[PDB]
From a paper:
Of note, three ([name]-11, −12, −35) out of six Y489S−F486S− clones shared the same clonotype (IGHV1-58/IGHJ3 and IGKV3-20/IGKJ1), which is frequently utilized in BA.1/BA.2-neutralizing antibodies from diverse individuals. The side chain of the F486 residue of the [name] interacted with a hydrophobic pocket at the boundary between the CDR-H and CDR-L loops of [name]-11. Furthermore, the side chain of Y29 in the CDR-H1 of [name]-11 formed a hydrogen bond with the side chain of Y421 of the [name] in a unique interaction that depended on the CDR-H1 sequence of [name]-11. The F486 recognition modes of [name]-10 and [name]-11 were structurally different, and [name]-10 had more space around F486 than [name]-11, possibly accounting for the [name]-10 tolerability to F486 mutations. The solvent-accessible surface area (SASA) of F486 was 3.6-times larger in [name]-10 than that in [name]-11 (28.4 Å2 versus 8.0 Å2), whereas F486 in [name]-13 was completely buried (0.0 Å2). [name]-11 and [name]-13 had similar escape profiles limited to positions 486 and 487, reproducing the reduced binding to F486S and N487G.
Residue numbers in the entry:
A (entry chain D): 1 to 215
B (entry chain B): 334 to 527
C (entry chain C): 1 to 223
The structure:
Amino acid sequence: EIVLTQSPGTLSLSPGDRAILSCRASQTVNSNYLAWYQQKPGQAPRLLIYGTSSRATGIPDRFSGSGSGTDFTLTISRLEPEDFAVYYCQQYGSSPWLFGQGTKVEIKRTVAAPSVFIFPPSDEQLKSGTASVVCLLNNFYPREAKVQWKVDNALQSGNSQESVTEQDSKDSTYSLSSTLTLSKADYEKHKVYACEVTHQGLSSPVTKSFNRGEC
Amino acid sequence: NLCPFGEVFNATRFASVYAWNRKRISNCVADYSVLYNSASFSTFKCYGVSPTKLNDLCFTNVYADSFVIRGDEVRQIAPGQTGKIADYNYKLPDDFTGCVIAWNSNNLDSKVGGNYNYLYRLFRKSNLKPFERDISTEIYQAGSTPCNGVEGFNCYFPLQSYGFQPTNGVGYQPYRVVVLSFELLHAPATVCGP
Amino acid sequence: QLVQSGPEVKKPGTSVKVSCKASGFTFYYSAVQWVRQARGQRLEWLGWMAVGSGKANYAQKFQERLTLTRDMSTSTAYMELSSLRSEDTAVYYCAAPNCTGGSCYDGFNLWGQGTVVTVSSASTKGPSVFPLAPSSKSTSGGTAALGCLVKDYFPEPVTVSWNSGALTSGVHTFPAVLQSSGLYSLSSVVTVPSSSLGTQTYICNVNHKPSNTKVDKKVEPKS
Ligand SMILES: *[C@@H]1O[C@H](CO)[C@@H](O[C@@H]2O[C@H](CO)[C@@H](O)[C@H](O)[C@H]2NC(C)=O)[C@H](O)[C@H]1NC(C)=O
């Protein structure tokens, strides 16, 4: 079959700089059956380039495709605020029309340190038999960031479901939420709770800890 | 000496709609009322000539065309009709004179598992003029790119086959159609009945 | 233009059918392909079908479960999938080129709006709202954060609002996640100054349409 692999995964470029992509195949692909699609979060994909060289109807001239054989490229002359999305490359000459893994384009800005909060569970949550402790990460630019939940200087696992918001518009910073959905049984037989964070924008990891004695 | 209508109307096999067969008839004495009073045909429409008064009229030579089409499809065999069959397979002229006959052929054309010996054209670059055939099977070119002999996206085979099943509805039931067209030209004008 | 049917929720082991109605162009010369995408994942190709003759092609993974059909009378294309599993939860798209006459466009420029299909066994249930009251430990440098917690609701669409929609400055809602019990849960937070606590009536407005339950849970600082 035919496998497509877009080599550059994610690219963060400020508006103005030209951007490039690289959709490379394994076997020779017909030059008349290749296309590029643009998708925004929550909308159906939109066709951009068809036939490896010609653009679609109404597509602004900044987009332009080139290349043939096992190499194919997409070039944006100067980025615009509404051109930040995910781009897929697909070929339909053979029988299986496999897509590509996609490439995400995001705004690049300055590195901002995150904010750390801790939320003790509600008393009314105690009645249901489950404990809910939340550690909140706010306003940090680099996507990579990890949190380890610590109970009595022990790293608990299996209850750290993760949730990330989309890039913001005015400042383009991310917000992170981690919830420690913990059973009631473990709640009383331990004392010290903590969530430790490590971020590229922080010189050293910041440890935020909570105790049930001051509840 | 009588015209051989029986061999046409009782043939063992019938041609496909895209390759309908033609057989001219001349120098013989014909009889149409015996055909008319069969009480077995389904439709008998004669545009321009009264079927009861065919015996009292004389022409120069007649043509007989036959094929097989779907039951719901019989309505397109008429002057001034519009449809895929009229466009791509068999078109009648506006001033057509003659008769069209069709009757059900379930017990002879339908079998268990389906008969795939009848085909009909799907696409054509241009509409058909009256009374011509197209036996070409070259790959169609829907898009603006040459097919180069390979079937795929925007390159479709022009022909597919009917699927006839005994359990199919009367709408999908096969029908055998025979079309007679009478010609008139300066000639001895031989063919006409007693 | 391509218009699809609405979202549907099924039980494991059953089968589903999705229709993709077309209008505004010569549907006879077109061709449709089906693409599905999970939540935050890559696009996956299923197959394609030529509407002119009904011929279809399928990928190896979904060869024995996917069936594509057509209806010339209503210009409607049908797709069905049997023996659904939990991982089949995704959104499905239908795409076809714009055909005007004999000639037609060389790409799948026309796309549908998509249909959401969920495969699960847990029955529908209303949500429960739990307040995230701010505390002294939570407050940091004058900045304070508070919000509400929503749990154990099966249907996807839920909404969060503040001050009956008046409070939206720096509001954060997070994408819903799936627990081990099969019931969804999300969180919503907002930032306010430490001088704001104890002065304004803070409450989160939420709703769950399939349960037809509307809750406005007032939150107060922890004592
Ligand atoms: C086709 O063949 C059938 C049967 O061989 C013909 O029907 C016969 O017609 C004669 C004269 O009308 C009758 O005496 C017979 O009883 C009929 N037989 C049956 C079984 O109906 C039919 O006439 C032939 N077709 C044509 C156009 O002559």
